[PDB]
């Protein structure tokens, strides 16, 4: 059977109540193995499955810094997107992103994906080729034009076809 590793990020703004809330969960098939919550007291990625606890401190460090840095990108984005849509500063808004990869029964790369949404609807997603973008609207098109000129697709493709598949295979074996 094939398998999948998927990460789900969620940033919710809260005007007059501090920085946005950031939650990140990682899945290997139907099993959640890690989690990050900006409102929790540890401020670090945490294990939620037994087979991941064995990972080293460098892993936890790296994964913690990476998700946090992503959360900061999301807060700049929450502002940018409010302007694109011309909404008030008082409302709360959401940015969601799911990304992952599927491997075959033999653990070979099958598919990869990186998709995001604004306020529960599609915004910008990377096409199957992992080389081009699909913009769901006018606002996303603005993003697409910037991104197609800065080659952010190549950055994601390297991860989705490289790092993603290789770690999924590690998780599959350790679990």
């Amino acid at each position: 059977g094939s398998h999948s590793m998927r990460y789900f990020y969620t940033s919710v703004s809260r005007p007059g109540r501090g920085e946005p809330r950031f939650i990140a969960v990682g899945y290997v098939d139907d099993t959640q193995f890690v989690r990050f919550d900006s409102d929790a007291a540890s401020q670090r990625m945490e294990p939620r499955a037994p087979w991941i606890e064995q990972e080293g401190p460098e892993y936890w460090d790296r994964n913690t810094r990476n998700v946090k840095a992503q959360s900061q990108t999301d807060r700049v984005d929450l502002g940018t997107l409010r302007g694109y849509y011309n909404q008030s500063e008082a409302g709360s808004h959401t940015i969601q992103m799911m990304y992952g990869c599927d491997v075959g029964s033999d653990g070979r790369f099958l598919r990869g994906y990186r998709q995001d949404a604004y306020d529960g609807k599609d915004y910008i997603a990377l096409k199957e080729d992992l080389r081009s973008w699909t913009a769901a609207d006018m606002a996303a098109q603005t993003t697409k034009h910037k991104w197609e000129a800065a080659h952010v697709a190549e950055q994601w493709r390297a991860y989705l076809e490289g790092t993603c598949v290789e770690w999924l295979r590690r998780y599959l074996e350790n679990g």
């Binding site: 990460y7 990140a24 990682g26 990625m45 892993y59 994964n63 990476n66 998700v67 840095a69 992503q70 900061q72 990108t73 700049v76 984005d77 940018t80 997107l81 990304y99 990186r114 915004y123 910008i124 993003t143 910037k146 991104w147 800065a150 952010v152 950055q155 994601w156 991860y159 989705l160 790092t163 993603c164 770690w167």
Partner: peptide, 10 residues
């Protein structure tokens, strides 16, 4: 293993 942080703004 999480993807590197997105550096490109929307």
């Amino acid at each position: 293993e999480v993807a590197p942080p997105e550096y490109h703004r929307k």
